[PDB]
Amino acid sequence: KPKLLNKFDKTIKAELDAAEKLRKRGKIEEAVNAFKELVRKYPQSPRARYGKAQCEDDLAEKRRSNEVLRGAIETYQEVASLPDVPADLLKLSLKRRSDRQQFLGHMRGSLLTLQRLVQLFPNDTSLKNDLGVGYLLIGDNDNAKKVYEEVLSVTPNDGFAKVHYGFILKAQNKIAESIPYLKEGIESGDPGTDDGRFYFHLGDAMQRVGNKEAYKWYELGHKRGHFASVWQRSLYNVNGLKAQPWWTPKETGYTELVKSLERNWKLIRDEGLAVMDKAKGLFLPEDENLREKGDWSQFTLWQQGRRNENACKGAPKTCTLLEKFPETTGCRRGQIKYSIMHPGTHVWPHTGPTNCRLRMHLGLVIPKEGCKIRCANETKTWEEGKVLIFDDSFEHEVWQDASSFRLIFIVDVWHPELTPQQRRSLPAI
Amino acid sequence: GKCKNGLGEYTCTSLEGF
Ligand SMILES: O=C(O)CCC(=O)C(=O)O
Numbered sequence: 480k481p482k483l484l485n486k487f488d489k490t491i492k493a494e495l496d497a498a499e500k501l502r503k504r505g506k507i508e509e510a511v512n513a514f515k516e517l518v519r520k521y522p523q524s525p526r527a528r529y530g531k532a533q534c535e536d537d538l539a540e541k542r543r544s545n546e547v548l549r550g551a552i553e554t555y556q557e558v559a560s561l562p563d564v565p566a567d568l569l570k571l572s573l574k575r576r577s578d579r580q581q582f583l584g585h586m587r588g589s590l591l592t593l594q595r596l597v598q599l600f601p602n603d604t605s606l607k608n609d610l611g612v613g614y615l616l617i618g619d620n621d622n623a624k625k626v627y628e629e630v631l632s633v634t635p636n637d638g639f640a641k642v643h644y645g646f647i648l649k650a651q652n653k654i655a656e657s658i659p660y661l662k663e664g665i666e667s668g669d670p671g672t673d674d675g676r677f678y679f680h681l682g683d684a685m686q687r688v689g690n691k692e693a694y695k696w697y698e699l700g701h702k703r704g705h706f707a708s709v710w711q712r713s714l715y716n717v718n719g720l721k722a723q724p725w726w727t728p729k730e731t732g733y734t735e736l737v738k739s740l741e742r743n744w745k746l747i748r749d750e751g752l753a754v755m756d757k758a759k760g761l762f763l764p765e766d767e768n769l770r771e772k773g774d775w776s777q778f779t780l781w782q783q784g785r786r787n788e789n790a791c792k793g794a795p796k797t798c799t800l801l802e803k804f805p806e807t808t809g810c811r812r813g814q815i816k817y818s819i820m821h822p823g824t825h826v827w828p829h830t831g832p833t834n835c836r837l838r839m840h841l842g843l844v845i846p847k848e849g850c851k852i853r854c855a856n857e858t859k860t861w862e863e864g865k866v867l868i869f870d871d872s873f874e875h876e877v878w879q880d881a882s883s884f885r886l887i888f889i890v891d892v893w894h895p896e897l898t899p900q901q902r903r904s905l906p907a908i
Numbered sequence: 909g910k911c912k913n914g915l916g917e918y919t920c921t922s923l924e925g926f
C-alpha cells in the first residue's frame with residue numbers, strides 16, 4: 480504494497496518509520512508521544528496523523544477503554560480531512576473508523592462513514608458490501624437490499640453480495656427466491672461467505688420447501704466448524720456444554736424451580752387466562768417468521784434478564800413467584816413468557832440462537848389430543864401442571880391440531896454447566 | 909429485532925464496546 484506516503488511524507492519517512500517501530504514493538508506510550516511530536520511538527524502529515532490514530536487504537540485495546548477508542552475514531556477522520564492524502568491511506572483510515580464505530584455500537588455513525596467511503600471510491604465493490612452490512616447491523620433490511628442489488632447489477636457473480644442478498648430474501652420470507660443466492664454465494668468461496676448464518680438459513684429455506692438436500696448443507700456447516708452438530712445449529716455457543724435434546728429436572732439441577740412451577744401451576748394458569756379474557760392485547764403474535772400456518776402468540780414477563788414491569792402488572796403473582804429464581808430471571812439469553820397456540824398451527828423446524836440456555840415448558844391448558852413438540856428425533860406431549868425441559872438449540876418443531884387452545888408457560892434457565900462468571904459476562908441474547 | 913425463539917436476525921447481540 481500500500482502507498483501511504485504523499486510527497487511531503489516521503490521526505491520525513493525516517494521519522495515516520497521510527498515512530499511506527501515503537502508501535503509495532505508494543506512501546507505504545509512512547510509511540511503516542513513520538514507521533515504527537517510528528518503531528519505537532521508536521522501538522523498536515525497524513526501518515527503522522529494515521530500513526531497517532533493507530534496508537535490511540537492500540538492504547539484503547541490495552542486499556543479496554545471506550546473513551547480512548549472514541550478519540551482514535553476522531554483521529555482516523557482527521558486523517559481524511561488533511562490535504563493530499565494517498566488513496567490507500569484514506570481508505571484504510573476510514574475503514575478502521577467505521578469498524579471501530581461498529582465495535583462501540585455507533586451504528587448510525589458507522590453508516591455515515593461507510594457512505595462516505597462509497598462516495599469517495601465509487602468503483603470499490605467491497606465498500607458497497609460493507610455499507611450493506613452497516614444497514615444490516617442497524618436493522619435496515621430495505622436499504623441493505625438496495626445496496627446488494629446495486630452490487631449484483633454490476634458484478635453479478637460477487638459471492639459476498641449473493642449470500643447477503645439471499646439472507647435478506649430469506650428474512651423477508653422469499654424462501655424459494657433466497658435459495659440460489661445463498662447456495663451459489665456459499666459455493667463461491669469468496670471472503671465472507673464461509674459463515675454459519677448462511678449455512679443456517681440455506682438449510683432452513685430448503686427444509687421449508689421440502690428440498691431433501693437440506694441436511695447435506697448442515698453436514699458441511701458442521702464439518703466447517705459452524706455447528707456443534709447437524710442437529711444443534713445454534714450460533715452463539717459456549718463450547719463444551721453438555722448437549723442433549725431432552726433433559727430431566729434432576730439432570731438440570733433446577734429441581735427447586737421445577738417444584739415451584741408444578742406446585743403452583745394453577746396460579747400461573749389463572750393469570751394467563753385472565754390476560755386472555757381481559758387484556759389479550761398483551762399476547763403478541765409470534766414475529767420471527769417461524770409459523771408455517773396458524774396462530775401463535777406470546778406474553779413476555781422477562782426478556783434478556785430484564786423484568787417487564789407493565790407486563791408483570793398482568794401476572795403479578797406469577798412474577799412474584801418467579802422473582803425467587805435468578806437462574807431464570809437473570810438468564811440474559813432466555814425469556815419467561817406465556818405461549819398460546821391455536822388449532823391449525825404448525826411451527827417450522829427451527830433452532831434457537833444459543834446453546835447457553837435450557838427451555839422449560841410448564842403445561843397450563845393442554846387439549847387431550849392434537850398437540851406435540853419434537854426435539855431432534857423425539858416427539859413428546861405436554862401435561863397440565865407438569866414441566867418438560869429441552870435444549871432448544873437442537874432442531875425442534877411444534878404442531879397444534881387440537882379443537883381448542885393450548886396454553887403453556889415458557890421458562891428459560893442458564894445451562895447448568897455455565898459458571899457464575901460466564902453467566903455475568905455473556906452478552907445478552 | 910431480537911433473536912428470541914429463532915435465529916432470524918443478522919446479529920443477535922448488541923455492540924457496546926469493551
Ligand atoms: O410450543 C411453543 O409454544 C413454542 C415452541 C418453541 O419453538 C419453543 O418453545 O422453543
Ligand SMILES: [Fe+3]
Pocket residue numbers: 829830831871875913914
Ligand atoms: Fe423454538
